[PDB]
Write an enzyme that holds these catalytic residues in place. Structure first.
Site, PDB file in Angstrom:
ATOM      1  N   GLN A 171       0.817  -1.209   0.000  1.00  0.00           N
ATOM      2  CA  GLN A 171       0.000   0.000   0.000  1.00  0.00           C
ATOM      3  C   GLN A 171       0.859   1.272   0.000  1.00  0.00           C
ATOM      4  OE1 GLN A 171      -3.196  -0.389   2.908  1.00  0.00           O
ATOM      5  NE2 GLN A 171      -3.382   1.873   3.006  1.00  0.00           N
ATOM      6  N   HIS A 228      -8.836  -1.843   9.265  1.00  0.00           N
ATOM      7  CA  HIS A 228      -7.860  -2.062   8.226  1.00  0.00           C
ATOM      8  C   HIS A 228      -8.046  -3.466   7.628  1.00  0.00           C
ATOM      9  CE1 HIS A 228      -4.019  -1.555   6.213  1.00  0.00           C
ATOM     10  NE2 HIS A 228      -3.654  -2.737   6.674  1.00  0.00           N
ATOM     11  N   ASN A 235      -1.013  -8.235   5.932  1.00  0.00           N
ATOM     12  CA  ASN A 235      -1.281  -6.806   5.982  1.00  0.00           C
ATOM     13  C   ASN A 235      -0.877  -6.232   4.589  1.00  0.00           C
ATOM     14  OD1 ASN A 235      -1.095  -3.998   6.390  1.00  0.00           O
ATOM     15  ND2 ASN A 235      -0.121  -4.177   8.432  1.00  0.00           N
TER      16      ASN A 235
END
Ligand SMILES: *[C@@H](O)[C@H](CCO)NC(=O)[C@H](CC(C)C)NC(=S)Nc1ccccc1
Ligand SMILES: [Ca+2]
Ligand SMILES: [Ca+2]
Length: 326
Positions: free
Chosen positions: A77, A240, A264
């Protein structure tokens, strides 16, 4: 059989650019500030200060579309709240077949290169082919948004640009639902689980879903926005999206223990509790399993026991790839 999104025709556009000796410039999603955003990514925002749109060829001598496969390590990200999309892309890569339906084969910065790429998304009950030019937001010669751990690889940057295009801009992608992206990537149907109310058979449900190639995601619900992206004591992130990337049972001190693996989409910042990469629990597992399952690397991906997982996380999404018609 895919609809041409906005009637833009990938092969014809690429054949014309090559013929006229030019690079594609996408009039439907131009390298301008409306394509970034209006507010946080508005023109007068400090988030967009010094952003210049650059082609991957302008960034280095050997840009590649895909290096060593289109795999989840390619999803890191950038400065945008699109965790939900990115988690969905990282999950998508686990099944090669549906991955390369979304990211067609044959795309290159060499043979047939005219600055145009394409991707297929499920939108309003049909597959659509979306093109983009490869002008990407950069600051100081680095990508601002998604990038690959492999610095010269661009498929994920371009896929995220195409998804921003179907939503109107990058800023439309800040805050969202992993399911939506799962569905846009697949045509599937999503079922969600409240982990504090899990069915007694949930781990078996997970095992079977991953076997069949379904897309799984998880998150910690926040009810207050001061908690958005808060880091927990054990190093989880709240509000998240994570990807669920595996589920395996291990023999721990002779006992069978249900583990679950997740990633993640930041590409870093991992759980530090039991079953983490450098955790002590691994010393007590079968050494074939430890070597098979455990990787000591800050890569955003880690294991938890299913027991801790259903305590720490609050929501599980499963996208099934072969839904019933209605
Ligand atoms: C992840 O980077 C972002 C940060 C927001 O700036 N988080 C989200 O987009 C979360 C992801 C969920 C919790 C899996 N969703 C949010 S903030 N809101 C939302 C919007 C639409 C549908 C569900 C949830
Ligand atoms: Ca790669
Ligand atoms: Ca890791």
């Amino acid at each position: 059989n895919a609809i041409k999104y906005l009637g833009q025709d990938y092969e014809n556009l690429r054949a014309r650019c090559l013929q006229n000796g030019v690079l594609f410039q996408d009039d439907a999603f131009p390298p301008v500030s409306h394509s970034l955003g209006f507010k946080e990514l508005g023109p007068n925002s400090s988030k967009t200060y010094g952003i210049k749109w650059k082609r991957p060829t302008e960034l280095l001598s050997n840009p590649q579309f895909i290096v060593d496969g289109a795999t989840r390590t390619d999803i890191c990200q950038g400065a945008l709240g699109d965790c939900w999309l990115l988690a969905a892309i990282a999950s998508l890569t686990l099944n090669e077949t549906i991955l390369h339906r979304v990211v067609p084969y044959g795309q290159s910065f060499q043979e047939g290169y005219a600055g145009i790429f394409h991707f297929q998304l499920w939108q309003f009950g049909e597959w659509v082919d979306v093109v983009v030019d490869d002008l990407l937001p950069t600051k100081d010669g680095k990508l601002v948004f998604v990038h690959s751990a492999q610095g010269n690889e661009f498929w994920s940057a371009l896929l995220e640009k195409a998804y921003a295009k179907v939503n109107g801009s990058y800023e439309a992608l800040s805050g969202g639902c992993t399911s939506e992206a799962f569905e846009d990537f697949t045509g599937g149907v999503t079922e969600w689980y409240d982990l504090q109310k899990a069915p007694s058979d949930l781990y078996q449900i997970i095992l079977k879903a991953l076997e069949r190639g379904s897309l799984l995601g998880c998150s910690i619900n926040i009810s207050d926005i001061r908690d958005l992206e808060a880091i927990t004591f054990k190093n989880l992130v709240r509000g998240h999206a994570y990807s669920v990337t595996d589920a395996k049972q291990v023999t721990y001190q002779g006992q069978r223990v249900n583990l679950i693996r997740m990633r993640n989409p930041w590409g870093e910042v991992e759980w530090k509790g039991p079953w983490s990469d450098n955790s002590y629990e691994w010393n007590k597992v079968d050494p074939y399993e430890r070597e098979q399952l455990r990787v000591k690397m800050e890569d955003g991906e880690f294991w938890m026991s299913f027991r801790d997982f259903i305590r720490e996380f609050t929501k599980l999404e499963i996208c099934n790839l072969t839904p019933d018609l209605e």
